[PDB]
Symmetry: D2
Subunit: 417 residues, 4 copies
């Protein structure tokens, strides 16, 4: 543990300062024997847990057979199979018609390829983004990202090409934030340049687990159709079954014009990403956008295996909704306890993307560091880090689930004397 070598732009080796060894399911091991229940799961990257056996076999068998790893754009059997499976298993049973673009294997890369697409498809530079939205930190993505910490660090380069509307609930309760947006769309001097696209998370991740209301989602969708705006849904953290459906926008029965995916798309933790799009929007011309690792064949293999093993029927999906309910129940209890001790707290979320909003980052950091000492890995989000996220693996055993929540509850109580 003498890593003087890594930069000072670290995050997770200051919060959880140990050397991790092996991993399976939701259990992680460290060099000193210690074992941890994982409610972080790589920030929503391990929706199927660490090193799932069916994925681990598919990947290994492919490596053993000397399947090409680095394909760039080239057709390969893995790529063909991936697109086959995604259309057969996911897209068609949900009535969705999309073509796939593969950009660089990162969320920010998908986001940059989606907004650039939208900009070219409509002839307009402006992207409407939402309060507390996170979408990545590359200069292009960064324009849609609201966090001052990232934005103040560019080095003298103001972002451009993006306008912020208030997300659902930002002005109170009941207050329609979309009506302000509707008025700005119709006001020539309002200050809102006509957007090529609205970009939205259905449940805001880094922004503090803020799940958009279904009627709100549906009205935004009609607002877009009525105003020649593509709806980009960023399903990079909320998707791949995290909110209890495969795509988080299923709950509202909307069909977004463009969808980005990344984190758990590969199932194993392999860097992977893509951008679904309605066919007619495929206005790209050959080679206008690229990225060395746009053809990561190993990610193709584990993604196909994950779709076939988990999304062939509704069983898994319905088991996430059910696991969500228990996390929801035990977070509400925790907010009740905190509230009655005179520290206001509340619960929100959707599926297994759930949040315990304590007062302030100082309280959340106490509850979190204590849970780490007690054997649970859980982390924060929100503008202040005041929301304790459940981002556990969707596959988590019931013992490991109730086992992690117990450790959380014990840690809250220990913090509260």
């Amino acid at each position: 543990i003498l890593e003087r070598m890594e930069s000072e732009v670290r995050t997770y080796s200051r919060s959880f300062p140990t050397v991790f060894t092996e991993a399976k399911g939701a259990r992680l091991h460290a060099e000193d024997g210690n074992q941890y229940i994982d409610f972080l799961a790589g920030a929503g990257t391990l929706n199927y847990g660490h090193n799932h056996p069916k994925l681990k076999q598919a990947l290994a068998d492919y490596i053993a057979s000397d399947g090409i790893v680095h394909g760039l754009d080239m057709w390969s059997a893995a790529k063909r199979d991936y697109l086959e499976t995604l259309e057969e298993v996911i897209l068609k049973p949900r009535g969705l018609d999309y073509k796939v673009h593969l950009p660089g294997p990162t969320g920010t890369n998908a986001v940059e390829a989606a907004i650039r697409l939208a900009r070219n498809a409509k002839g307009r530079h402006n992207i409407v983004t939402f309060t507390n939205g996170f979408h990545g930190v590359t200069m292009g993505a960064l324009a849609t990202t609201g966090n001052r910490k990232f934005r103040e660090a560019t080095g003298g380069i103001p972002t451009q090409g993006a306008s912020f509307m208030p997300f659902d609930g930002y002005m109170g309760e009941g207050v329609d934030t979309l009506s302000y947006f509707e008025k700005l769309l119709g006001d020539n001097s309002g200050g809102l340049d006509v957007p090529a696209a609205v970009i939205i998370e259905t449940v805001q991740g880094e922004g503090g687990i803020n799940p958009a209301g279904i009627p709100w989602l549906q009205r935004l969708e009609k607002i877009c159709r009525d105003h020649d705006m593509l709806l980009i849904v960023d399903d990079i953290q909320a998707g791949c079954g995290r909110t209890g459906k495969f795509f988080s926008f299923e709950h509202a029965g909307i069909t977004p014009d463009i969808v980005t995916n990344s984190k758990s798309l590969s199932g194993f933790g392999l860097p992977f990403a893509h951008v679904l799009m309605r066919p007619e929007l495929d206005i790209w011309k050959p080679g206008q956008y690229n990225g060395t690792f746009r053809g990561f064949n190993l990610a193709f293999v584990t993604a196909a295996a994950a779709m076939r093993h988990f999304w062939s029927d509704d069983t898994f999906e319905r088991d996430v909704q059910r696991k969500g309910r228990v996390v929801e129940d035990r977070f509400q209890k925790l907010a009740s306890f905190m509230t009655e001790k005179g520290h206001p707290a509340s619960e929100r979320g959707r599926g297994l993307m759930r949040g315990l909003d304590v007062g302030d980052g100082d309280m959340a950091d106490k509850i979190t560091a204590q849970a780490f000492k007690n054997g649970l890995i859980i982390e924060t989000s929100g503008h202040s880090g005041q929301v304790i996220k459940c981002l556990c693996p969707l596959t988590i055993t019931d013992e490991d689930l109730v086992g992690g929540l117990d450790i959380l509850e014990q840690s809250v109580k220990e913090v509260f004397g």
Copy 2:
């Protein structure tokens, strides 16, 4: 092929010039479902400097998967990351006299350039970044300001890039004109148009730009210009690094020490997505969490990358073998260039190590040669601004047999097109 055509976006390029379905890959040979077989002179655009699926790297990767090691470490500390950083220091940096620290952005070349220039801009409190004619450093909006190609910059959707100034690269202004004198003057000039730059980003041998090797005197002078004016020197070694030029770091040929180095492509050794930024230790200006990205701790790349460094770079045998093979290509590329000129069609050769280029006149003759080579079983791509430089990006590990075999297919293919 009917699922791949109907469902993949039309932005694709490599499935267009190579319209077959690849399956197995080993060394410098690729297989297709139709029974065709290919010698790979493209190596994923220099991403597979050790060939496809190298035995030694494959076994290290499979062991790690079998033992259930953590794949996605986020940013936490793992044994794979320790072994990577220590291997990096002992095998690579220390014997080269290099004192750097390591920062891990997204597993992407653009992502590394973006962090690199963002770090330079905070270090110096200046926003402008000086770049050179024909440089490519990525397509995400931050990097694109330093990337020269109009086909990308015109597809931004109406956002003009911001933050970069373009300087004439070595040789751009004819022979025997030192382009750095122009640059040196603009720096001293209050109304000359150059916002004072935090950093200069450069490829020692330009990739997409047409295989342009900057001369050793030129590079050394640019290093001194950078110190004489408080500018950081960023060397983008994403393509020209990891052995491609005959030394690990391409800038070793000129004995300069940059302040910031970007690496990607061949860093993993296996075709796993990976990148790091190297900084002089004082430059560690970042505050915690100012930059991130989800696939930083990609541990599988830590294993393959550590494995490649110890296996190929624990001594200088491999180094010198690249040097010798680079010379084989230089010879056959020159001879090929003579053939083409003397048939009324001018051509030249340039490059360094196994980063070589055969400059035919125009992008249409080079397409004819490149496509003919594809029908004869050679995978070879063009670079340059018109598409006129046939580049050798064959694996550094290629066997003499497959190297001469690949160059044999090229020459036949060139003679074939002249008919």
Copy 3:
């Protein structure tokens, strides 16, 4: 004529007022056609003392006769020293305003450009907060704070940068406080608002459609600005120089901005002219970071210093503007009364002699405005739709002409019906 071929097709006031004008005095203009016209436009608030006021004419002609320097660059002239002393003795010191003067170029866009540049340098922040419907000029920098879409889309491929829009008072509806949304974003790390160096506002929005800000609203903004370390920039280019019944339109609320821009009626004679008022501590400029050739335009110095002494040496002018404003309000009300009881709803707004009749649509206001020109009244519109007919008559206007002008618009409205 030669006025149709030689003149570029940008022109605005030569498709609505296509006669050739000759002699001009008070609120009366004479055409070549020989007809007279009553001017309820006053150069859109540039001629707050009417065309060619006798006192100013004389001070001007006397100055040209002695051969006083006309163009002094930056030089100290006697006319420059006089303007500063008069503004000091007659305007600033009696209101207890402590202000330095910076003279930019003689456009109004040039003053806003110098005001926001000053604010950014003072506060070390690039972002400027602007309001829905505001208008502050169309050069590329001032253009970033202007709301109008017809200007921002005509930049030819360059998006604006360094400005964010907040809802102006009332924009979100009845008895909703739009500054509560603004205060929340300031405290929200990721609400998407880069921390402003400055707010820039018109107390009554000119082009936006004659939108008077509430006095408590203005008072709360000033509170928010000091509490959050932001300069308050009041753009009094149109609503200034006694247009709202006080010399500074912010005098109604008792606040004191940090930076005040003036231009239109500053000369008092149609001379191009503008300045930036700034609290002394904010004088962060280094010698010569902002030039502009017609800096020291001594002809305007003469006419602006004469107008101040003549009209603003006491209370009388002030109060007769307030009275004339109440006349206009009584008729605009009676006219919105008429129009509504015929199924065409309308309303009156304003403050002082900056009032507007808000008829329903732009195309209806266009009939009335065009019809008024047929009956001998020049009157133009503003608003996002062109919705609002504005009263921007001179403040010196005689009661015969002010009544005469309103009788023409009253008739011209009836004819439209």
Copy 4:
């Protein structure tokens, strides 16, 4: 008289260079309250090309005021507006055979440059604008992107400019080097770094930049380069216009006809803010109202501008008179320059017409001579990337007595400063 120091911002620049109170001015002589009298070789940085308060224009102005003529016309047609478009077409454009229409922006040179490059971007549908080293074209944000001076560009408060690329101006790259070749190469290089411009903006003699006169060949090649690659030519005649170079338009020396022309400084002849944009009629892309400017119809400027075209440009007498005085200025400057060169301080004369410059070593010598000249009765300032160039910008109408008079104070001041 110390309230001009208290009530005014410290942004002032010509308040510190000449700290007296000026009262009455006529011709090239300015009176002070101190009763001191000054010869003006500055004239509003070239804004009084017919001297201070020319009597003929003074009369035309006085009579329009006396008649209660409309001063602020916005955009409405008026007498004084029609007469200005008439006399411009009749006395100026047609005799020179030029087909131009007029946009009236706000009455500043920045506002003119902004309208022109904004218009150019709309006509060609491209955002980039090529400008040249040491170019100066205004300090509002849009014109600022084309301006070279760091001192203004560092003062924007964290906002980098956007939409402009810099090319080396004629002679920048040394003795006998055609900088335009570099330009043409970048125009055809897909990844050279230049976004394909909508237009090129240039001063035929660079004003603020240090009196750099582009050559006639060079200007003619740049016209050909623009017409070939589909680029408008804007010529920025704010300072070098209205006769200063020997011709009404400084581009007459080269016979080229630009697609866009900007005028402001001396355009009204009387020191009144005023500016127009000259375009070819087919370039009137504008839709109604897309560009604003309150003080566009400033009719008092129409009056004096027309009166000055009639009184000064009806024959070619005046225009050759200035060409004559340019040579007596040119002569003495070379004398003064050979003097300092022989006293061990190299210097040089350059210019064209009555835009002339004496280039000394540095700004500190410039400032010493400039300051001495003020004590001896001559108002003269500098320009250049360091203010190393003592610029002559006396009125074109200066009498021979005052022109040799001013030239004599300058010579006296240089020898005093030396020995």
